Amino acid sequence: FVKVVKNKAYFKRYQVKFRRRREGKTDYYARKRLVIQDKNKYNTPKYRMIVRVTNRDIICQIAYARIEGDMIVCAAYAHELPKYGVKVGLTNYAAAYCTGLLLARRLLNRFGMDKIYEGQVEVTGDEYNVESIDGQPGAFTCYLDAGLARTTTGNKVFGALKGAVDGGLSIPHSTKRFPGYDSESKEFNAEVHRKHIMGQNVADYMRYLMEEDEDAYKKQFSQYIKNNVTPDMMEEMYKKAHAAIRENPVYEKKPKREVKKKRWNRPKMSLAQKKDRVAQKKASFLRAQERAA
């Protein structure tokens, strides 16, 4: 035959990687540079905005790391958006912007910094960076943790960043990976960015599919017509969502209720059960031979 690679000597010398690397979730090469602090800063917290886009949700957190594991100081999710007004399309660019705005205003409400550093209330899509007013507490500085998302032009990890820096946080960035940047001429057009902030690219697709074929329209947008979301009112829907987010961004936890404490999985088998099972198997195997021989 051919020599088997995964022999006993293969597993004796095998060094596993880290658990998060084995699950694939964490780039430790980027983590070593995103997280650690200069040693002459002496346990000053180094914050980061984690933006993670799942299939049906957008998660925005802000974390700083100690020895025991990093501490989440504020978290904003995209499934909280039906409270604020938008119910359909919780995983697009406009929902990423609303999640970043939630995270920014919710952190400023925790630190008591709502009135100072309002941010860009009337959105334009331009390069906005908050400036620390002297005689006041300084602006919150954090850095984007894009993770393993490929940071090309038009990413929702940068939409959440635009939402945060319009909410009032100081995240250093350039306006190159925002949509509207023309790589042919190296110039950023802010009006195209404002369309993606207000979700007008989805509005054009709904109008396009409505004029092409109503069957493809109902296939692609089933919850839009179920919840009565039309391309003309999405603009004011996202404006009212922004207004409701900046009006009250404080998160109230859902009340935990008492549970009957049922076990859904299987408990681990004990030693005596494992010793008896193999004895029953051997006793069955000898009996099946003396009964068939």
Binding site: E23, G24, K25, L148, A149, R150
Partner: protein, 170 residues
């Protein structure tokens, strides 16, 4: 009743012509795949120089293309129309994948242009299941498991069932 997430589909169809020289032969052979598929193919170069075959290191040798979607179905049907819907037992691999080779590309149905001439090529069919993107997506890459794998015996049954072909022993 079988789980419809386990439906055995065609993932991709890989085509190449291995010419072995450089020059206008490669351009004509690439034009064959370009007018056959509708997409431009890509040139494949040599790994290292062997002096008995006339090839050199980093010299362009072959022309290959990959076809996915509903176009691969009709290109594969044009191939098995030439092959009379028969294959051998040795044309199926251990991983559930199968290919064959065709000697005159005109038999596809493509028209003869006197400047290009006659080339043969070979087709390879990469079957798949819904869920095979796990092994090559970037974020959380994982294995495919054992029950979800395609085998030689199950790929032969798929070919005999859907294309109504026959497997002659050899």
């Amino acid at each position: 009743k079988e789980n419809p997430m386990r439906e055995l589909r065609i993932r991709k169809l890989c085509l190449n012509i291995c010419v072995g020289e450089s020059g206008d032969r490669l351009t004509r052979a690439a034009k064959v795949l370009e007018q056959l598929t509708g997409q431009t193919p890509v040139f494949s170069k040599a790994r290292y120089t062997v002096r008995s075959f006339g090839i050199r290191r980093n010299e362009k040798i072959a022309v290959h293309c990959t076809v996915r979607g509903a176009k691969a179905e009709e290109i594969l049907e044009k191939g098995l129309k030439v092959r009379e819907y028969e294959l051998r037992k040795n044309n199926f691999s251990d991983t559930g994948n199968f290919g064959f080779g065709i000697q005159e590309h005109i038999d596809l149905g493509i028209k003869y242009d006197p400047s290009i001439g006659i080339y043969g090529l070979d087709f390879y069919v990469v079957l798949g299941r819904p869920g095979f993107s796990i092994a090559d997506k970037k974020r959380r890459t994982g294995c495919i498991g054992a029950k979800h794998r395609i085998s030689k015996e199950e790929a032969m049954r798929w070919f005999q069932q859907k294309y109504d072909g026959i497997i002659l022993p050899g």
